[PDB]
Amino acid sequence: AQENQVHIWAVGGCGGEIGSAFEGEVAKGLHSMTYVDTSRANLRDSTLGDDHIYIFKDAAGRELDGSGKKRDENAELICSQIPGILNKHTPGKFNIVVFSLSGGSGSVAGPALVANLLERGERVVCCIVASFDDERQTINADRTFKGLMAAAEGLKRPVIVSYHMNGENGKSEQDVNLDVQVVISQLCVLFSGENRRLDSADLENFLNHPRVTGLEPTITELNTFMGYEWTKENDSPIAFCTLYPKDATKVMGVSAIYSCDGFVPESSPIREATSFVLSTDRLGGIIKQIADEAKRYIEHRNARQQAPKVGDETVAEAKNSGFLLF
Numbered sequence: 001a002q003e004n005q006v007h008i009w010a011v012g013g014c015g016g017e018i019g020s021a022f023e024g025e026v027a028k029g030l031h032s033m034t035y036v037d038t039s040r041a042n043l044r045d046s047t048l049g050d051d052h053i054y055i056f057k058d059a060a061g062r063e064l065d066g067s068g069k070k071r072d073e074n075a076e077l078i079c080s081q082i083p084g085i086l087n088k089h090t091p092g093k094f095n096i097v098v099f100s101l102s103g104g105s106g107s108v109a110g111p112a113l114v115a116n117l118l119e120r121g122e123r124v125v126c127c128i129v130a131s132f133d134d135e136r137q138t139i140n141a142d143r144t145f146k147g148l149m150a151a152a153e154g155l156k157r158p159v160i161v162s163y164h165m166n167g168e169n170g171k172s173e174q175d176v177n178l179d180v181q182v183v184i185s186q187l188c189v190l191f192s193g194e195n196r197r198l199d200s201a202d203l204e205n206f207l208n209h210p211r212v213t214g215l216e217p218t219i220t221e222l223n224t225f226m227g228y229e230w231t232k233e234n235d236s237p238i239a240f241c242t243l244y245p246k247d248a249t250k251v252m253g254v255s256a257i258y259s260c261d262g263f264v265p266e267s268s269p270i271r272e273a274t275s276f277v278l279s280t281d282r283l284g285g286i287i288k289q290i291a292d293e294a295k296r297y298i299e300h301r302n303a304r305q306q307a308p309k310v311g312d313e314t315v316a317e318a319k320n321s322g323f324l325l326f
């Protein structure tokens, strides 16, 4: 029982915790939100009912209890159950899939949701939080980013990603959550459809940029800025869409292949011009950073001292039940 203009998919524990701040917005009809996870451990106190919560189930129809950072543990079940999620929870006109590249559940059900929505022709913008605390997390993040790039190339439709880092500038998880919440709120205001000069076709061409730009469909990065100071550093984006308050001066000095304009209603919570910029020039740095983390963890792993193994003849001596040598 919520408005379906904007749909938020909280995938995994990181997605569910990030999106827990938008429950009141669902209560106010601003947007609809669906929790997708393999575990209910994080969702023990959510205000939203179980009709907005979907938990993956195994063959026996029993709800799972997390993947434990093992992407291949339940990948088949997730990929098989993704269409049922979209049937039960009707995807919104604009979808904001939030997931973490490091977990074993969000990093699988996130890209699966994105790929299924893109194949259905839906408009989806991802919010991504990547962590590099353990080697398994780094490998999962690298695999998920490669999979998203492959999905963008093979679906002939860009995968728009709002990339965030847990360890960037020494920020805690709370700061990253606040950043993702700001990005999601700005996207919800952009996708509300109440902007004066912004149409559905404009947003369709903005998200599916190669329709107008003609560039190769690849993974695209989304950056959000307030004011006009961002024109100096991102003067050459692929595309950008700006929402202005009342009697706000336009943005100049930006040379983009595609551009859109919108006007915020007088009652909307926007007081300065907000821009949504698409670019792929910073993807190389992200890939290099992920590869550096993977290389660091692999060089740490190769230095592991070999575990002291008991003799093979001792294992022959241990063929009795209980592995007692006597």
Ligand SMILES: Nc1nc2c(ncn2[C@@H]2O[C@H](COP(=O)(O)CP(=O)(O)OP(=O)(O)O)[C@@H](O)[C@H]2O)c(=O)[nH]1
Binding pocket: 012, 013, 014, 015, 017, 018, 037, 038, 039, 065, 066, 067, 068, 069, 100, 102, 103, 104, 105, 106, 107, 129, 131, 132, 133, 137, 166, 172, 173, 174, 176, 177
């Ligand atoms: N910035 C944030 N990072 C988070 C948050 N929750 C988890 N994480 C980070 O993400 C990593 C764990 O990934 P997830 O929480 O998505 C694990 P997942 O839910 O897929 O596994 P299960 O708990 O078995 O379902 C780990 O590095 C955490 O520090 C969060 O709310 N914010």
